[PDB]
Structure 1
């Protein structure tokens, strides 16, 4: 599991939280807790007012007229889910949102986006939502009676790209998917088309450099192609991701977030210049071998 970095990455409130399962002869507070867990997960921790509470699907779940899987399906078919996530977003953003909500994980490969977008355009949003719900992964993870939940831990049949893209999608326990730095932009278009992985930046509070997002162009690549040769005498190279540089000003600082590859011997100086600048280090990744 995730133990040491759980507090930093926000995994710990989901580490001590067990999956919510409705028993076959369930109590009323069990149905209410399934309702609350579904409204937190499927609607992505958005604030839900009483006007949009979806009383019909709640009432069908409360007497067992529908299951938890059918309740998740109903609240994903609803106009509230569509106006939260579908109508004002790119289709890749919608696909990764449905993956985070209904399956609790980030999309793995480009082929999943291909399948879901082709099925949406071929058969619409409801058909696509049904495909997330009627997936083998949904049954081996949640089935019929368990509310979907975020799956940060390693399971059978996952991919390690999904672990990094999960924190590209999950931005903290105090956070909703609509309330993130890319306001409507899909976070995995350049990560799934290029099949690349950006470094995991944790949420706010625990991580001072929480606000690093990469630009659409002019980004330093992750691996140092070249090694120590442009830097003279060096041993190891590290990509430092730096957030919120504002001490010199606009002529000097054009971009708040800067990613640079620096050696060991320049590491102290680089760290010192970040501190002097007032910048925040998001992550440091070993760029060379």
Structure 2
């Protein structure tokens, strides 16, 4: 696990959290926690305004008409998600964000960019979103009833490059995907193309050199 450097790396709050599961015959408070957990995770800790809430999807989730996964899929396909992460981004940046939001990890290899770029170009954004959520990886980690969460810790099937690239996409707890130094630029386009990694730079506050970014 991550113990000594957890707070320094911004991982300690997630060490202290547990997966948010919607049990059968869930209560009212259970549904609200899922909605809050889904909004924080899938939308990258961006502030969500009341006018932006997916009230219809929230209703169906609360009613048991859609499961957690289908609620996640509904949020990921919403105009709110596309506005935040699709319409103003390079598709490689979109693919990066999708992996972090929906799978809680960074892309491992250029093959993933190839797959999802082609899938978007040939079948569209909604088809690409389905690929993440209907993936074997999503099934084994979250299944039908658990909100996605960051997978900092080592798991079966991991590659070491994934760990270092997580801190390229995750920049601390008091932060959002749309409020990072690199702004709209793809974080991993170069790393994936060259199969290279970079030294982990921890979040601001706990790391004086948090702002180090290489030049072109």
- Structure 1 residue 30, shift from structure 2 partner: 0.4
Q: How many residues are paired up?
A: 216
- Structure 1 residue 22, shift from structure 2 partner: 0.3
| Superposition TM-score, scaled by structure 2 size | 1.00
Give the Cα–Cα distance (whole angstroms) in 1 for the partners of residues 63 and 91 of structure 2: 35
SS of the residue aligned with 1:8? coil
- Structure 1 residue 44, shift from structure 2 partner: 0.4
1:273 alignment counterpart = none
- Structure 1 residue 28, shift from structure 2 partner: 0.6
- Structure 1 residue 3, shift from structure 2 partner: 0.3
- Structure 1 residue 107, shift from structure 2 partner: 0.4
Bigger Rg over Cα: 1
- Structure 1 residue 136, shift from structure 2 partner: 0.2
Give the Cα–Cα distance (whole angstroms) in 1 for the partners of residues 162 and 53 of structure 2: 31
Q: Deviations over 1:222-281 (max 9, x none)?
A: xxxxxxxxxxxxxxxxxxxxxxxxxxxxxxxxxxxxxxxxxxxxxxxxxxxxxxxxxxxx
- Structure 1 residue 15, shift from structure 2 partner: 0.2
- Structure 1 residue 6, shift from structure 2 partner: 0.3
Q: Which of the pair is proportionally richer in strand?
A: 1
Residue ranges of structure 2 left out of the alignment (5+ in a row): none
Runs (4+) off by over 3 Å:
none
- Structure 1 residue 5, shift from structure 2 partner: 0.5
Q: Deviations over 1:24-46 (max 9, x none)?
A: 11011100000000000000000
- Structure 1 residue 146, shift from structure 2 partner: 0.2
Give the Cα–Cα distance (whole angstroms) in 2 for the partners of residues 183 and 195 of structure 1: 22
Q: Deviations over 1:9-58 (max 9, x none)?
A: 00000000000000011011100000000000000000000000110000
Q: Deviations over 1:183-217 (max 9, x none)?
A: 1000000000000000000000000000001111x
- Structure 1 residue 84, shift from structure 2 partner: 0.1
- Structure 1 residue 152, shift from structure 2 partner: 0.4
SS of the residue aligned with 1:6? coil
* Residue 202 (structure 2) pairs with residue 198 (structure 1): no
2:66 alignment counterpart = 66
- Structure 1 residue 127, shift from structure 2 partner: 0.2
Residue ranges of structure 1 left out of the alignment (5+ in a row): 217-289
- Structure 1 residue 77, shift from structure 2 partner: 0.3
Q: Deviations over 1:161-180 (max 9, x none)?
A: 00000000000000000000
Q: Deviations over 1:76-118 (max 9, x none)?
A: 0000000000000000000000000000000000000100000
- Structure 1 residue 160, shift from structure 2 partner: 0.6
SS of the residue aligned with 1:127? helix
1:107 alignment counterpart = 107
Give the Cα–Cα distance (whole angstroms) in 2 for the partners of residues 135 and 158 of structure 1: 15
Give the Cα–Cα distance (whole angstroms) in 2 for the partners of residues 80 and 210 of structure 1: 30
Q: Which of the pair is proportionally richer in helix?
A: 2
- Structure 1 residue 7, shift from structure 2 partner: 0.3
| Superposition TM-score, scaled by structure 1 size | 0.74
